[PDB]
Write a protein that binds this ligand. Structure first.
Ligand SMILES: CCCCCCCCCCCCCCCCCC(=O)O[C@@H](COC(=O)CCCCCCCCCCCCCCC)COP(=O)(O)OC[C@H](O)CO
Lengths: 570, 570
């Protein structure tokens, strides 16, 4: 997958080569430093002079200042690459995530698709800011240090290189054993704590049995076992500290003592021995840090397969519409449509339904509250495709009209009309470009929204603050109705609350003034039967099939599947 | 606090004094080491001989071995103190988190009252062990190091003490500024992620407007602000590294050069210069470690307050009642009780109810399906207190009796009878010990619990696996029904949920043996109006006063609110 992660850095090679060059300079400065420290000490003790001027100068000016400056500049350019990579991953992932067909969002969760947008992209940008930085820096420094301490005195080099594996071996053995015993104690305490968790979380029954003493005592037993487990963990820790400490001591004193014999023999200088000891410590620390960072880098490159998982997934439907004639009537028809989801294809919610809607006239819908009525709402909004059948808007199917045009000639208001945390002069005129104020005023009046709006804390621009949860259901549905009416839509798809505790004048006036005195091929989805009393063609349905048509007077006349419900209401 | 926290270590004084002494020894050895290292280098350079061998000995054996062994023993004894303190706190906390009156369990949560237990007692023991370890160790070692590097050469100590505060001040300044800018960048990225989250989490209403593109654009610009906020953070990081590095360098080079002149002038000996530089490094490291760890210690004692608020919180309702007669009659009478909650004391959910149960005679209780009927069982089980009224039980009220004897005379069967993770021989004697297994199977046959026990995959003594889901509704109902008979209770209580998943076999076994044949003053709080199949009395009340009594044939005659329920339902 690293053939991809390169391609999302290809517009950053300028920053990358600048940062890499200054990284290499920083490492070389910090690995040429100890040799000249050794030359300084040797200039003190061997030739007692003021050659120390020139050597302290060589240390302080070029090597030290160069290391510090290059370190700062490498830090700067890597922070810049971090932010630019973060921004471009977030933008590409979103812009190709918000263009999937809705069944995508029905399958996958929402907390997961926000984890994969904040935390995962943070990890896959730290993979290039931090971990590759540290790993490459310390690799260059380790190579430099090894070559130096070979050039200085290869006897001590051979000694310490036969030495370091012994330290690593004993430390790793005892550390792994102690870690195992520590994990065992942690698991024992959690298992012993789950009993207290349950007896706390179900205190009613225990109270009913007067059995609290025999829960304190079982906790005392299930804990008093952990102590006898823990003594062994203490002993293992003690022996681990002894083992690591004494092996490190033996290697270090062997180094210093062989070095002493060399310096007295006359095969080195005091400066080169001090240089060798400092190089030994630097090599130890750098080996430690390189060994540490591999966990983080493995975790990062594992996280880099969640972003690229979604950042290019082909959508399963195309919005290939082209037509957009400005003049419609609104002949919503259905041609034996049967529809099922993509989540459970064997169950059925609509079977060969074929019912029409007369232009410019109300046409409600109702069912047994157990069959699929909402599914006709979700099919007409062109969310999901169809299995069998076809739907058409004034002759041509809805698969042919232009996308924004199609959802501008239809509308929707629903059971839970969500209002995004914005201004109410924006929530109303949501999807269409900045229509002026007076149209919004006429719209809010035409849904009894303008009533309360002027009585809020500012009027129209009262942004729906407090994380967008301040308004109540009545104003909610009325402002939603205002939102659909702004577009002047030839069709409308309306839904009604199950409690129906609102003013309720809006729906009857929609059957009377809002949609009856104008071209509005309104459809209704009614749970509360307070609107059955007036309609045009109540097409009651069940099991995904049409059973009755015509006015609900004939439903009362042919009292099948409907007259049973009106007695269930009273 | 600190005083009680000390009072919960009082049994550990032996372990504490032993570990403290060994901590002192380890710190003293590790601070005596570098002086003798400097003496070794001295003997290499100044008087080139094998007088070095004495000093390599006095470094490798005494100081190094002693330091490492003492560190091992200190680590071991602090692990033992950690586990003992953790155990004692958890035991005492759970001992006094189960003896509180149940209103205290209603008010508080249950996720908190386990997170508190586990993680907070972990923190309180971790405070003492880990951080008093680190703080006390580094205090002793820093005192020793300062005394030495004053003993060696005082001009050098005065120069490095003019040096270290300047390093600390410059690092402090620039680190504060850089952390400020990094925090602002994190906040801006989180804000833009929230504006993307409100569109991910509300996809359907967005799709309804063909408004994904403007959402992608809003996200793009809300990101392209972060880049401009981030360049300033890059410059802050640059200057932070430059400032810290250059100050540290100037201090170090001034010290090394002044030491060079000191060695040239005969004022010192090169071994003491190496000793002084090693002491400078050690002192810097330990100062940084203490400066890190004080914050963790303060956080630890800030968490250590959450335990002692519950350790000795006195219980509200004390079960000081102490009485247990041999035999009894079993006449329960709710006598003008004035019961009141403590979670919403404005309302009076039960005010002066008056009705008496009869020995062996069923007394069903149903109500208006919204009013307070579910409280009577909690009144009977002596959960909550009561202001006025006295439930007289055979000469004495319930409050006078023994706790265990009380809940051994009375039982209950909840709606969803909670059954903890045990075996189905444990549960059928929860509080009652030393039960013969044939009594268990007999009192399981009396409620038809023998059915799904033998066919379950382990025989009789099957453990309730998967955290209590290997049984179902009617199963666990028959289980709890088997519970309420193993104790031979002269009083019984029952309840049942609105689902009524059992196929009415519960009522067949109610009227079978322990409702008519055996003497059990059965009460019942039944939904769905199913208990009217048979009754020896019926109480229907509302909010404290009883409106209807007598057998249900009077309820047919006195058709108030009752005869309409059987016809409205289906
Ligand atoms: C960083 C900016 C530097 C600017 C220039 C300053 C010039 C003076 C400093 C020289 C540059 C060194 C830069 C990198 C060094 C980092 C590693 C380090 O500091 O290690 C020292 C400190 O490491 C420690 O923490 C020491 C603690 C243990 C003491 C070790 C004693 C000798 C080992 C034998 C004892 C055996 C027991 C071993 C237990 C670890 C080791 O001291 P040394 O005496 O070996 O050499 C230092 C030299 O004399 C400076 O002039």
């Amino acid at each position: 997958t690293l053939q991809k992660l390169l391609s999302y850095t290809k517009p950053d090679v300028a920053f990358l080569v600048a940062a890499s060059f200054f990284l290499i300079v920083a490492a070389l400065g910090e690995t040429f430093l100890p040799y000249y420290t050794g030359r300084a000490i040797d200039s003190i003790v061997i030739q007692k002079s003021m050659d120390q001027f020139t050597t302290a100068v060589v240390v302080v000016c070029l090597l030290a200042i160069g290391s510090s400056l290059a370190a700062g500049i490498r830090g700067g350019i890597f922070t810049l690459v971090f932010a630019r990579l973060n921004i471009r991953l977030r933008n590409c992932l979103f812009r190709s995530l918000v263009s999937q067909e809705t069944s995508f969002f029905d399958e996958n969760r929402t907390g997961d698709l926000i984890s994969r947008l904040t935390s995962d992209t943070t990890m896959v940008s730290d993979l290039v800011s931090q971990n590759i930085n540290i790993f490459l820096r310390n690799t260059v420094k380790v190579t430099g240090v090894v070559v130096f301490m070979f050039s200085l005195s290869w006897q001590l080099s051979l000694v310490t290189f036969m030495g370091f594996p012994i330290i690593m071996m004993v430390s790793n053995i005892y550390g792994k054993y102690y870690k195992r015993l520590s994990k065992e104690v942690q698991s024992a305490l959690a298992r012993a704590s789950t009993t207290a968790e349950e007896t706390i979380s179900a205190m009613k029954t225990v109270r009913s049995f007067a059995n609290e003493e025999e829960e304190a005592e079982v906790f005392l037993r299930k804990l008093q076992q952990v102590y006898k487990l823990n003594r062994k963990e203490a002993a293992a820790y003690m022996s681990y500290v002894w083992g690591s400490g004494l092996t490190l001591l033996v290697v270090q004193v062997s180094i210093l003592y062989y070095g002493g014999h060399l310096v007295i023999s006359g095969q080195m200088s005091s400066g080169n021995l001090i240089a060798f000891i400092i190089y030994e410590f630097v090599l130890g620390d750098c080996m430690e840090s390189v060994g540490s960072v591999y966990s983080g880098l493995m975790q990062g490159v594992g996280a880099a397969e969640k972003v690229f998982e979604f950042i290019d997934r082909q959508p399963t439907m195309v919005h290939d519409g082209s037509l957009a004639p400005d003049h419609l009537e609104g002949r919503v028809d259905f041609e034996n449509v049967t529809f099922t989801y993509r989540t459970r294809p064997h169950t059925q919610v609509l079977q060969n339904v074929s019912f029409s809607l007369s232009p410019g006239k109300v046409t409600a819908l109702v069912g047994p509250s157990g069959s699929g009525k909402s599914s006709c709402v979700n099919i007409l909004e062109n969310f999901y495709p169809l299995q069998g059948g076809r739907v058409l808007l004034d002759g041509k199917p809805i698969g042919a009209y232009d996308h924004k045009y199609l959802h501008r000639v239809i509308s929707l208001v629903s059971q839970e009309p969500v209002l995004f945390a914005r201004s109410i002069t924006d929530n109303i005129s949501y999807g269409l470009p900045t229509v002026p104020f007076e149209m919004v005023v006429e719209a809010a009046q035409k849904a009894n929204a303008h009533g309360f709006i002027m009585e809020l804390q500012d009027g129209y621009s009262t942004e729906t603050g407090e994380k967008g949860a301040q308004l109540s259901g009545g104003q909610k549905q009325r402002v939603a109705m205002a939102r659909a009416l702004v577009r002047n839509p030839p069709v409308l798809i309306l839904d009604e609350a199950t409690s129906a505790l609102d003013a309720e004048s809006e729906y009857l006036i929609q059957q009377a003034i809002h949609g009856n005195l104008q071209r509005h091929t309104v459809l209704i989805i009614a749970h509360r039967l307070s609107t059955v009393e007036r309609a045009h063609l109540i097409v009651v349905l069940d099991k995904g099939r049409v059973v009755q048509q015509g006015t609900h007077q004939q439903l009362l006349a042919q009292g099948g599947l409907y007259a049973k419900l009106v007695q269930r209401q009273m």
